[PDB]
Amino acid sequence: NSVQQQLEALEKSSGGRLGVALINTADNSQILYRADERFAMCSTSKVMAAAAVLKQSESDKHLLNQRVEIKKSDLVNYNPIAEKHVNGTMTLAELGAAALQYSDNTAMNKLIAHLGGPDKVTAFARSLGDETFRLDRTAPTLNTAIPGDPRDTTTPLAMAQTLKNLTLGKALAETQRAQLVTWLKGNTTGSASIRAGLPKSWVVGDKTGSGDYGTTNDIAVIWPENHAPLVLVTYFTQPEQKAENRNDILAAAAKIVTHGF
Secondary structure: OOHHHHHHHHHHHHOOEEEEEEEEOOOOEEEEEOOOOOEEOHHHHHHHHHHHHHHHHHOOOOOOOOEEEOOHHHOOOOOOOHHHHOOOEEEHHHHHHHHHHOOOHHHHHHHHHHHOOHHHHHHHHHHOOOOOOOOOOOOOHHHOOOOOOOOOEEOHHHHHHHHHHHHHOOOOOHHHHHHHHHHHHOOOOOOOOHHHHOOOOOEEEEEEEEEOOOEEEEEEEEEOOOOOOEEEEEEEEOOOOOOOOOHHHHHHHHHHHHOOO
């Protein structure tokens, strides 16, 4: 079976809907599956918010060290880092790190608030040439992932293109690009997702996201030992609201599309 046939078969076995976009930067070739269809991003959107703050920091050398007050009322669930800092402060850099490496929802919300609201994250994506991305809500409501709801969605291809631009390409200044990459490489939440489908020694940066409708996502940049980087988006969503999440599906998809590389 071809790679396309393998992906179709994976989706057929899955009980849902699979979206894959792999960009092989060796030759700009792609492996696309439902790559122009919309999926709820869930916490994969945290990358865009952090990157928008990194962009601002290009022109404000004091921004990343700016203090942000954390209060009990800022806690919204799934905030493992921000809860440690209630009554104290975190810097914008520390909020970026927490949002990306621990998927901290309070950290995401502080980034969004700093920028001026979800629409400002959309405008940043647009500024990178991403015609698809939209952020509409804060956390945790950005995870409702209702089938056919356009809020807080993108397509696998748009997200792969933008992730490539962000991490390997022209979106950010060099220090800020490097900072984003450092953050993604240090992610703690992705062991069982794309990473589990790859050779164990490949270097990987990723951001996961999960939500209702069993929506289970991961976006990654992958550095093989002897080959140019790969950029991979694996999105997955299910028809029933209380479906379990399925990171095993993402690992399986990653294994299919990175075979040979």
